[PDB]
C-alpha cells in the first residue's frame, strides 16, 4: 500500500512538549517503530518514535489515539506502533536509544 522509502529533506526546530504527569485513566502508552504518513483526515499522522495516547483499541486494523506532543488525533495502525510495556521490537530502545534522558532518582522507591 503505496510502501516506499521515506526522505523529508528538511528540519524544524520544535520546542520539547513534556508529558503530562498524574496520569489516570483507561489509556495505553504506545510508540511508532516505522513512520507512517496520514493518508486521510480520519487517519493519524505519526512517525518514528513518536508516542500516542491510545483512545479506542477495539478494532486491532487502526486504533484511534490522540498525539501526545503535537496534539493530533485520528487513527493508526496497531501493526506499526507497539506499547512501551510490552514493546515487541524493544530491539529498537536496546540497540537504538535514539534520543531520552537519564532516570535519575534513588529516592522513589
Do not use: C, H
Amino acid at each position: 500500500g503505496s510502501s516506499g522509502s521515506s526522505g523529508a529533506s528538511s528540519s524544524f526546530s520544535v520546542v520539547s512538549s513534556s508529558y503530562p504527569t498524574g496520569l489516570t485513566g483507561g489509556v495505553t502508552i504506545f510508540v511508532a517503530l516505522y513512520d507512517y504518513e496520514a493518508r486521510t483526515t480520519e487517519d493519524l499522522s505519526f512517525k518514528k518514535g513518536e508516542r500516542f495516547q491510545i483512545i479506542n483499541n477495539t478494532e486491532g486494523d487502526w486504533w484511534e489515539a490522540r498525539s501526545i506532543a503535537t496534539g493530533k488525533s485520528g487513527y493508526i495502525p496497531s501493526n506499526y506502533v507497539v506499547p512501551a510495556d510490552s514493546i515487541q521490537a524493544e530491539e529498537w530502545y536496546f540497540g537504538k536509544m535514539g534520543r531520552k534522558d537519564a532516570e535519575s532518582g534513588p529516592s522513589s522507591g
